[PDB]
Design a protein around this ligand. Structure first.
Ligand code: S1Q
Length: 138
């Protein structure tokens, strides 16, 4: 009846009942990974922004092709980290380097309700500028 909300208290409960059709309707990115990190689900929204295909990512790991070079303890490490505890709950910002240039965004990974899957949402942050903070060598 109501619309979906990013980082909602019942975001998983809602999506669990919703299918791929509605998922793509979302105004944000949604990616479901398995215990190993294999792309189980992929909403069109994210596929459009990033430029990746859902039926093409299916089976492939998020750090395998979906994100080459993301095999760090900050991203990949956290993913498997929570999996060991049985509740991958992490919320931080990530940099998505593209052809047009790097752009900061919001990343949220919450383990599914069934436990045999993990939800990964992504929302582009607001526009903003920045400067350099370099000093003389010491
Ligand atoms: C939450 O993070 C993401 C969500 C997504 O949906 C897609 C991507 C990323 C993150 C990253 N993607 C890349 C590189 C992609 C690439 C694609 C095609 N050719 C060369 C490189 N790097 C370095 C990332 O950190």
């Amino acid at each position: 009846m109501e619309h979906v909300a990013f980082g909602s208290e019942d975001i998983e409960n809602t999506l669990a009942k919703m299918d791929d059709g509605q998922l793509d309707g979302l105004a944000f990115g949604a990616i479901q990974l398995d215990g190993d990190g294999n792309i189980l689900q992929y909403n069109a929204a994210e596929g459009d922004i990033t430029g990746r295909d859902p039926k093409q990512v299916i089976g492939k790991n998020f750090f395998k092709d979906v994100a080459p070079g993301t095999d760090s303890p900050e991203f990949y490490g956290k993913f498997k980290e929570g999996v060991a505890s049985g509740n991958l709950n992490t919320m931080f910002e990530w940099m998505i380097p593209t052809s047009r240039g790097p752009t900061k965004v919001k990343v949220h990974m919450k383990k599914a309700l069934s436990g045999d899957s993990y939800w990964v949402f992504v929302k582009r942050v607001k526009l903003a500028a920045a400067l350099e903070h370099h000093h003389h060598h010491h």
